[PDB]
Paper text:
We focused our attention on human RAD51, an ATP-dependent recombinase crucial for homologous recombination (HR) and for error-free repair of DNA double-strand breaks. We therefore explored the possibility of using a more stable orthologue as a surrogate and focused our efforts on archeal RadA from Pyrococcus furiosus, a protein that was already structurally characterised and is closely related to human RAD51. Here, we describe the complete process of generating robust, RAD51-like surrogate systems from this archeal protein via two distinct approaches: by stepwise mutation of the surface of the RadA to humanise the BRC4 binding area (HumRadA series of mutants) and by generating an archeal/human chimera (ChimRAD51) in which all of the BRC4 binding part of RAD51 is stabilised by parts of RadA.
Therefore, we proceeded with a stepwise humanisation of the LFDE site and validated the resulting mutants using biophysical methods (as described in the next section). HumRadA14 represents a “turning point” of the humanisation process as it is the first mutant to show detectable binding to BRC4 peptides, due to a combination of fine-tuning at the LFDE site and further re-shaping of the Phe pocket (mutations V168A157 and W170Y179). The structures of those mutants, where the LFDE site has been humanised (HumRadA14 and 22), show good correlation with the human BRC4–RAD51 complex in this area for the backbone but some variation in the side-chain conformations. Despite extensive efforts, we were unable to obtain a crystal structure of a complex of a HumRadA mutant with a BRC repeat, and differences in the BRC4 binding site are likely to reflect the unliganded state of our proteins.
Author numbering: 109 to 248, 255 to 284, 309 to 349
The structure:
């Protein structure tokens, strides 16, 4: 049974078929400021909510490769969603990735953390990798070896722990993001085999992301 995490946006959830799916890797790509990082932050809060509110009562793991994680943004999203910001921050496991090899290494200390948490009322239900390729790009056919291997460990983790894997870039589900007018963002499903290739409009607000 696939679990779905609400993005915060009805329009975006509809395009995704209800939300980002567990046992799958959602890959969101676009230029900087396109909403990819705002969506990752909103998901780290949403996952924590009960299923009736668009969550999976789960914990989140935020792997950061380019200093994109902002706890005061988590605080804001949580506050404006009527949650305790301190409790929300508590169930978001932040790990910084210093290079591609350490990035892959973190998947293993993600597994260790996911086991200890499995028999709790808040097991991990989301693993964010913001961004997937930055270290691979800046360090290197080869690099293409070490990449599709990293994606393999991500899949193992998604199936192994019934977690949604959410990656940003510039797999399962590729979503192209772009800025719109005025401060709106536009999403577009790419090569989706089970969903139609439409578009959805969403806003970056105080609640993270919404219509």
């Amino acid at each position: 049974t696939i679990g779905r995490i609400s993005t915060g946006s009805k329009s975006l959830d509809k395009l995704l078929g209800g939300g980002i799916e567990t046992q799958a890797i959602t890959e969101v790509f676009g230029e900087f400021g396109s909403g990819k990082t705002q969506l990752a932050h909103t998901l780290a809060v949403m996952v924590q909510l009960p299923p009736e509110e668009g969550g999976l009562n789960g914990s989140a793991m935020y792997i950061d490769t380019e200093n994109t994680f902002r706890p005061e943004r988590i605080r804001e999203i949580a506050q404006n969603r009527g949650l305790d910001p301190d409790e929300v921050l508590k169930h978001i496991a932040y790990a910084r990735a210093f290079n591609s090899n350490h990035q892959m290494q973190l998947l293993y200390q993600a597994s260790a953390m996911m086991v200890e948490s499995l028999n709790t009322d808040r097991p991990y239900k989301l693993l964010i990798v913001d961004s997937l390729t930055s270290h691979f790009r800046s360090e290197y056919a080869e690099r293409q070896q070490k990449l599709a291997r990293f994606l393999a460990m991500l899949h193992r983790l998604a199936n192994e722990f019934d977690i949604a894997v959410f990656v940003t870039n510039q797999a399962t589900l590729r979503v192209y993001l772009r800025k719109g007018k005025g401060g709106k963002r536009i999403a577009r499903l790419i090569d989706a085999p089970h969903l139609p290739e439409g578009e959805a409009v969403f806003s970056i607000t105080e609640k993270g992301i919404e219509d």
